[PDB]
Write a protein that holds these residues in place. Sequence first.
Motif, short mmCIF file in Angstrom:
data_model
loop_
_atom_site.label_atom_id
_atom_site.label_comp_id
_atom_site.label_asym_id
_atom_site.label_seq_id
_atom_site.Cartn_x
_atom_site.Cartn_y
_atom_site.Cartn_z
N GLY A 1 74.91 11.53 -12.94
CA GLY A 1 74.62 12.65 -12.11
C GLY A 1 75.56 13.79 -12.06
O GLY A 1 75.06 14.64 -11.92
N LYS A 2 76.84 13.40 -12.08
CA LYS A 2 77.80 14.72 -12.17
C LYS A 2 77.29 15.70 -12.79
O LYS A 2 77.73 17.03 -13.02
N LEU B 1 74.39 23.41 -6.62
CA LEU B 1 75.00 22.66 -5.26
C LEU B 1 76.47 22.07 -5.68
O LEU B 1 76.71 21.97 -6.98
N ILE C 1 74.41 17.47 -12.82
CA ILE C 1 73.59 18.34 -12.06
C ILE C 1 74.41 19.13 -11.02
O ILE C 1 73.80 20.29 -10.60
N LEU C 2 75.75 18.72 -10.93
CA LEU C 2 76.38 19.69 -9.87
C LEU C 2 76.91 20.69 -10.65
O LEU C 2 76.94 20.85 -11.76
N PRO D 1 77.77 10.16 -7.60
CA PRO D 1 79.36 9.47 -7.45
C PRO D 1 80.14 10.51 -7.34
O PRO D 1 80.57 11.30 -7.96
N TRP E 1 73.95 6.77 -12.67
CA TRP E 1 74.76 7.15 -11.51
C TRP E 1 75.76 8.10 -12.16
O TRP E 1 75.57 9.26 -11.66
N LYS E 2 76.78 7.70 -12.72
CA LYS E 2 77.75 8.28 -13.51
C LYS E 2 77.11 9.68 -14.05
O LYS E 2 78.10 10.73 -14.11
N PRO F 1 70.64 12.09 -8.74
CA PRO F 1 69.52 12.24 -9.45
C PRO F 1 68.80 11.02 -9.56
O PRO F 1 67.35 10.96 -9.84
N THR F 2 69.37 9.55 -9.54
CA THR F 2 68.71 8.39 -9.27
C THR F 2 67.78 8.54 -8.48
O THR F 2 66.44 8.40 -8.51
#
Lengths: 465, 534, 465
Positions: B23-24, C172, B26-27, C207, B20-21, C242-243
Amino acid sequence: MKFDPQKYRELAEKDFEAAWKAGKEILAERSPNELYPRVGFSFGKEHPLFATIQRLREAYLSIGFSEVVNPLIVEDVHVKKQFGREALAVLDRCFYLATLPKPNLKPISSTLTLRSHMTTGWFITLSHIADKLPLPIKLFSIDRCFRREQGEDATRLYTYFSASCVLVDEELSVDDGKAVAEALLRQFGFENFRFRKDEKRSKYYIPDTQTEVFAFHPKLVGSSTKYSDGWIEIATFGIYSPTALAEYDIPYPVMNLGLGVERLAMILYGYDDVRKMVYPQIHGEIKLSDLDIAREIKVKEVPQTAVGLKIAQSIVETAEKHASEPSPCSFLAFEGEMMGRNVRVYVVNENENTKLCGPAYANEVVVYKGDIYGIPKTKKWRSFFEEGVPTGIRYIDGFAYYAARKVEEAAMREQEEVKVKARIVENLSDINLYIHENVRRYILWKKGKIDVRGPLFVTVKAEIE
Amino acid sequence: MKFDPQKYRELAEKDFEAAWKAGKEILAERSPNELYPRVGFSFGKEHPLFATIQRLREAYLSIGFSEVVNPLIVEDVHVKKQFGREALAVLDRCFYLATLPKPNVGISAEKIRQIEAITKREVDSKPLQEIFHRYKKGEIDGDDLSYLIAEVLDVDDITAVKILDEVFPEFKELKPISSTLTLRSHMTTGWFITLSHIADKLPLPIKLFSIDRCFRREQGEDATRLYTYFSASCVLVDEELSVDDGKAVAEALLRQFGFENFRFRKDEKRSKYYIPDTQTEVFAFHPKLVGSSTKYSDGWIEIATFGIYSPTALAEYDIPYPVMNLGLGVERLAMILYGYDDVRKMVYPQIHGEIKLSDLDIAREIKVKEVPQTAVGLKIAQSIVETAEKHASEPSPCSFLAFEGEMMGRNVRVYVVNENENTKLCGPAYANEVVVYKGDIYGIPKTKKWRSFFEEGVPTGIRYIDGFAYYAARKVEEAAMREQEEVKVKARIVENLSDINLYIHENVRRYILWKKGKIDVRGPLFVTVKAEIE
Amino acid sequence: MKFDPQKYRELAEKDFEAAWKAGKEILAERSPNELYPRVGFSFGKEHPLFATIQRLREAYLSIGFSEVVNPLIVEDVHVKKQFGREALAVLDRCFYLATLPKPNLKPISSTLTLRSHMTTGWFITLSHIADKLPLPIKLFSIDRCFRREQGEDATRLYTYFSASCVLVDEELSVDDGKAVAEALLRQFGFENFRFRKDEKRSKYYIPDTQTEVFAFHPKLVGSSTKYSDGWIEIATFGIYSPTALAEYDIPYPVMNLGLGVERLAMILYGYDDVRKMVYPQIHGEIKLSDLDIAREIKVKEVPQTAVGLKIAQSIVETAEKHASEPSPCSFLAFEGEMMGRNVRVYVVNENENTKLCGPAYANEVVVYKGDIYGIPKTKKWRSFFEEGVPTGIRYIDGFAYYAARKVEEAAMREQEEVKVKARIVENLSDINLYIHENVRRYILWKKGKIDVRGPLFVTVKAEIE
RNA sequence: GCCAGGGUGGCAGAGGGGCUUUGCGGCGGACUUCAGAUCCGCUUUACCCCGGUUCGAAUCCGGGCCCUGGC
């Protein structure tokens, strides 16, 4: 009719089935001319020109362009300001406005002219915003233009609709033009585009920017014309020349793409002749569907009393099964009281060896390809009965009403015996049927015919006491 | 940036929260001119007039009437047929179509032409006494690229235009010639022609409608009337008709636009084309008007008019049946639905300079001039602020470390300082932000004195230090290329946006001026960035 | 009526004026209930919810987003695939689908659930195209969703419409979200926007991307609620994590913005209570305009013969000017033959010292704010007459018809003298007026009243011979 | 349609035959300045359109238009 919830509500708990079957009592009892399709709703229909215009609007909006109303009436000085020197020529294809002087006759022209194309007004409009609003500016407009092209009609009309737009940015090129033409034309079904430089090289377009766009539409391949290969010239565009832009203080280039509506519309709704598309009224194109003509075929005299119906109704029921027995012979059809006294309905044929009913008692009236035929439901006429709209009105069906409503005339006339017979049928009249004079003149105008004929040979006697 | 499903799957299937964390990553890391509102989507807007017209179409269609295109240019004979004697009073308020005749290159100007030296400018080429004659028989506009490019040499119009100017002054003697042709003053003029062709060939009732342009002169003024307008007209054809049928239609029509009550008074004009005592004027009440500044305070306004064509004119076109005609004036209806007082400003706004740009739109147009081009630069500035923020009340002089990293393969260290003394590291205006309120661009600091400019305006999110920071970061970045070794950029006071690295395309600037807007971005920023590049 | 062109055409050349004035002969002669506004057209009206939906569609299309139908019924495994671990919670607000087993009663649940929000289906859809179609992908959809929010109604409903979209590109950021929200909301009248990070930090959103959009609408400032400052939370959005994207093989980030329709609609058409907006039928909100109620007020008995009209018509003409003369007294109104014999119409008042007509003979029936009043056109009642819809039917006007049509009953009855009088008026009935039972039950339901009263005191005697 | 006062530059508003306001704002430049102020230079020297009077009109007379105290 309005029923009572409880009744049916409670009547249901007992024996449902018989309750359900009871429902048929609320259904209305319709007279002849109250039945389908002699009754039906209607609804406005739009014009292909306008429809297309709207389609164009959304198209333009769908790609960023905002709407604007451009000046229509303008001073020829504007055209002059725009076409540099070649302007003298242009003013020939344009009209001028002339008024009548107030006699304290002979119209007096003025410097006023109606815009030939949208471009004449654009500069006027852009002048007030090209330097103030943020770039890129994208504006469009779909309005009327006037042109004296040879001053004819066989080729083109005096007034047409332009679906124009203008793009204003620091950097532009013949490319932005092509880009817009695509986005626009694609939303209408065009799939492939080809651009070729326009020869006339109009002076208001930066030399060598003026292009002619050709688009491919599958709806055209196999068309009854040269547009068979599928392609067609659909729109033209260019970049305004610094010369003209300068005349109005416009600092940046401007891309202008403009397409002719009348053409798109014809393509979209399949019209071959512009005029016959936009002015169908004048060029006698009025049209009615078989279904519509059907609705128009009505009974002329229908039984007024509730009895009359169930009377003529039977009158038919008999001749349906007894239209065989050789004459002279007789069959009682109905017996009952109407308005005040009992009555009996008879159906026979006083003539020697023959049949009770003519061989055409059971012929149904049906419409097809604009014609009102009268034919027997035979494997021969099938198509007509499976591609046209059958009235549901048969010779007997139509006659009986005349009969029943006829004894009705004698009933309130004090009489006691009426002879209602019918031999030949040479039209709708002879069968108690009619169509409003305007639909007649219609079929006539559409060179359509009404073949309602046949030997009915059917007599009906009734006696009241 | 894109990632890998598999990877993220096999990491999430075990240690979720960690994926989760993660993920950032990819922004995207947007630079200054890549953040909201500096970026935005756009959409086209409809013009009120046209919008209204579209509604009208639906409204008519929705009540049984079918669209049609009546004749626009017609012979005044028609008018004379429709108004009997009074036909004169009308045709005077109408426009006639005049057109330029061809320059007779014979007789009048042929005798006094072949007496002198016709042409001199070497052009020769067999006497086009015929090709120039076809001009009197039948020519066009793009025909100028026919008698030059393919006649006397010289492509298209490289000499086609002037050879007409310096050799033929006849063209400058043309004057439009009137005619019997005109431009309808109202849809009615064209209804007779159209109805003439079908009033008896189609099933009754006949319900037709058309919303098209018309023309009319009126004291030749715009503040008194308009040269061209729109009429949402309709005609009802049936055997029996009465003003009632006209009222009904009117109601059912206006009712789709809001009006809730209608009143019909008789029109004193008693026009000839309408049966006497039928030409009704229709007044309708619409809420949007109630309690207004306009003469429609009470909510009522004359919205349309209608009558029943005099059997007199019907005959002039062989129409046996009576016909009802209702005519709505578009522009007005538009004005009401979209709130406009002056017609002219409503339809032709651009010309009457009624252009506008909401605050949000201005904010979007305020960019940042100097912006770091390298992934390093950004961090440099981001930090230059990061430090400039923390150490803000440190009595001068002094110094603090901002960034220590490698740029272009050469270690670098940037610092934020202050030369003078007896003050603080950064001026009392370093924290001010650019906000747009009621059309003006301000350079104010967040205070209970400015609340109104942050809860009604639109903050650009850029503060003096922010804009500046990005400036410096570029400087140091530039040096990392100039191979220098010590650049100390400084900013004292702020008079405008330039002294902050913020700019606005010229047009927006001019927009603000044309609207009498003000850009008050001043203040003592005072800040310097000393960066040692090795 | 249908006239002859020639006649008027030629008749015109003689004396135009008198020809024009002649025209009035083609105009129809209308009976009471054939007059405005007792007659009029009608037209369908659309629902604010749906209307708004469409407005939303065009809005989305107006900015590049193409339409798509997303899966509605899905297996909860999808929700699980999307909300990682927090999914157990989510499945509580969702419904499941249960069927009835075929008895060779008690419903049997299944793993099937109805999507709560659009996002559940998006992943399913995007999975098939995110890697094949060219970027950027912009899709939107406005369809139904189901949610068990506490399982109530006072706060929210079980089914709502989501106006969702998704943007798919290589790069994005929370910015693209804000960008879209603006473009979308602006087309609806919103002018200012503010975004605040959503606390619930749903797991399906990278998040700290999940945001809540607040918009400013002038239509709200001064509203009968807290939305007075003009702002309101209108939409939420984020970037998928992404998950979840990985669960469906989607390689690129995805921006998803979704707004609640029901809310926008209320804002757009001014509704305070969702339910009363979308389900007005149920929550008794039915409504009719004064004009509509007017149209519904009709005469009960109208003269059938053409004579009857011109009879009662006069009956009124008299009492209009002679409703003064003290009684006993008399005035002859009409004299003529109907159906077969001459007749005379009389109007008087057999009573001692008083007036011919009651002080309320000239009271007009008018509707206003849902009430059917009966009042005299006096400066007092003005407003009612200038803000309500006057029937145009006055006490006498309505009575006379009853009279005229009454002598008509005696005419074909062989009689020779009829006494038609009227004293008090305690309703529409006493004045020969009525309204369909359904409109009555209407006014009743709308707690509206009908104050049609007043002393008419008017008698009419007629004698046929 | 009708008595009359009047129709000046980006904004406001003084004068009145040709020389001529002024203020605001703007355009460019100057400042040891830590706050929204300071100084110098600057425009097309502006006064609807067609005639009349005149050496000369934006300032005098007629007609067409525009705001207003009014019928």
